[PDB]
Each structure stands twice: as structure tokens, then as C-alpha cells.
């Protein structure tokens, strides 16, 4: 279930200049070793279904952003199979899951705290399609999606950010809200 393939994106492939250019806006001091495309049909189809629903509701809003997420090597196969979906006890009592964080700029995700260097010094950051939708600033203490309207408090925001008009990060909460399209492997 949610089987996947991994294909190297070569420097000569159409999308390389764009993916590398975005990473290099803030990470040009690192050296890129490989960029790969993650091809997971079930995960892609489910993400696209969520995108279609959001596009049909949010008017002019550009619901998708491409953001970064650094992780340790041991999490890579999990992300490739499951994306950023989470399962745990009591998830189904409430309308959302535990937040998953993404950065606007690659250098944030390139921190060793996130993209932990592996045994060979290799660091791993995904360039992820994320349905940011309609967002507000995150709660300071209760890390859940806030209500949009005190008169309708089960209607929740799609994501939260640190700063509504100058974001540096986004937090996603819902299933199939993100697709791990590209994996960038790099070194100091
Ligand atoms: C595992 C992981 N956690 C976090 S928290 C956070 C980011 C980030 C990441 O890239 N990976 C980037 C923005 C704030």
C-alpha cells in the first residue's frame, strides 16, 4: 500500500534548474549531491483530491506552496511511503492531527537539528507541495488549527504560520495535506 519509486532528477531534466535554484536561494553554501523525484501514486492521488476540494472552496487563494522539510536519513523511507501523515492513539477524537512543519526557505530546514547528517555527512531536505490554504498565526500554547470564526468554531484554518504576512514556516495538520515531491541530498 502506497508503494513508491524513486527517480534521480538529472541536471539536464526540465525541472532541475527550478528545484536547484529554489534551494540555492538560501543554501548555495552547501553542495548538492543528488535530487530525486518521489513517485507514489496513492499518496499523489490522495493529495490531488484534497487540492481539488480546496481549490473549489478558497476562491482566488493559491492554496499550494512549495516548502522545505529536513529530516534524518532513517525517516526518508517512511516519508516516501506515508508522506507526512501520522497515526497514533486518540487521533480520531478530534478533527486534526499533530502538526507537521515546513520552511519557506531551505536554509531553515538545512539546520542539522532537522536534516541530521548521516554516517557519510549526507543531509536530506524534501521540497514539498503543501496545501497551505487559508492560514493565520499559530497559537502559542495549544498547537492545533485555530477556529476561523467564533460564531462557527468547528470551521478551522488550513495551516498556521509564525507570521501571517511574512511567513518563515507553515504547520500542516490534515491527512494528505502535503506531497514529498523532491528529495535533495547535500553536504556542507
Ligand atoms: C523534522 C523537522 N522539523 C522541523 S520544525 C521546522 C522545520 C522543520 C524541518 O524542516 N524538519 C522548518 C521550519 C520549522
> Which residue has its alpha carbon closest to ligand 1 atom 5?
101
Burial class (CB in 10 A: 0-12, 13-18, 19+), 172: buried
1-188 is classed in which CATH architecture? Alpha-Beta Complex (3.90)
**What whole-number distance in Å separates Cα of residue 90 and Cα of residue 98?**
11
- Rounded Cα gap, residues 44 and 62, in angstroms: 19
All three cell numbers of 172: 500542516
182: its cell numbers: 523532491
Helix (H) or strand (E) holding 153: none
Question: Is the shortest distance between the CB of 170 and ligand 1 below 6 Å?
Answer: no
Q: 3-class DSSP state for residue 21?
A: helix
The secondary structure of 27-39, three-state, reads: HCCCEEEEEEEEE
Instruction: Measure the CA–CA gap between 122 and 101, rounded to whole angstroms.
Output: 21
**19 close to 149: Cβ distance less than 8 angstroms:** no
Data resolution in angstroms: 1.5
Pocket test for ligand 1, best of 98, 101, 108 (most atoms within 8 A of CB): 101
The residue extents of the domains of the chain are: 1-188
Q: How many CA atoms does the CB half-sphere of 7 hold within 13 Å?
A: 10
In angstroms, what is the span from residue 123 Cα to ligand 1's centroid?
13
Elucidated via:
X-ray
Beta carbon of 156 within 6 Å of any ligand 1 atom: no
Asked whether 109 lines ligand 1 (CB < 6 A), one says: yes
Amino acid at each position: 500500500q502506497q508503494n513508491f519509486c524513486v527517480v534521480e532528477l538529472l541536471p539536464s531534466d526540465p525541472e532541475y534548474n527550478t528545484v536547484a535554484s529554489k534551494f540555492n536561494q538560501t543554501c548555495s553554501h552547501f553542495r548538492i549531491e543528488k535530487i530525486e523525484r518521489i513517485q507514489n501514486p496513492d499518496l499523489w492521488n490522495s493529495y490531488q483530491a484534497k487540492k481539488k476540494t480546496m481549490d473549489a472552496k478558497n476562491g482566488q487563494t493559491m492554496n499550494e506552496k512549495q516548502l522545505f522539510h529536513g529530516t534524518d536519513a532513517g525517516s526518508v523511507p517512511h516519508v516516501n511511503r506515508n508522506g507526512f501523515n501520522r497515526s497514533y492513539a486518540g487521533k480520531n477524537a478530534v478533527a486534526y492531527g499533530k502538526g507537521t512543519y515546513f520552511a519557506v526557505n531551505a536554509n531553515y530546514s538545512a539546520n542539522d537539528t532537522y536534516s541530521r547528517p548521516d554516517a557519510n555527512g549526507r543531509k536530506h531536505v524534501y521540497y514539498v507541495r503543501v496545501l497551505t490554504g487559508i492560514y493565520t498565526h499559530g497559537n502559542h500554547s495549544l498547537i492545533v488549527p485555530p477556529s476561523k470564526n467564533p460564531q462557527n468554531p468547528t470551521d478551522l484554518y488550513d495551516t498556521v504560520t509564525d507570521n501571517v504576512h511574512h511567513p518563515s514556516l507553515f504547520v500542516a495538520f490534515y491527512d494528505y495535506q502535503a506531497y514529498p515531491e523532491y528529495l535533495i541530498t547535500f553536504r556542507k
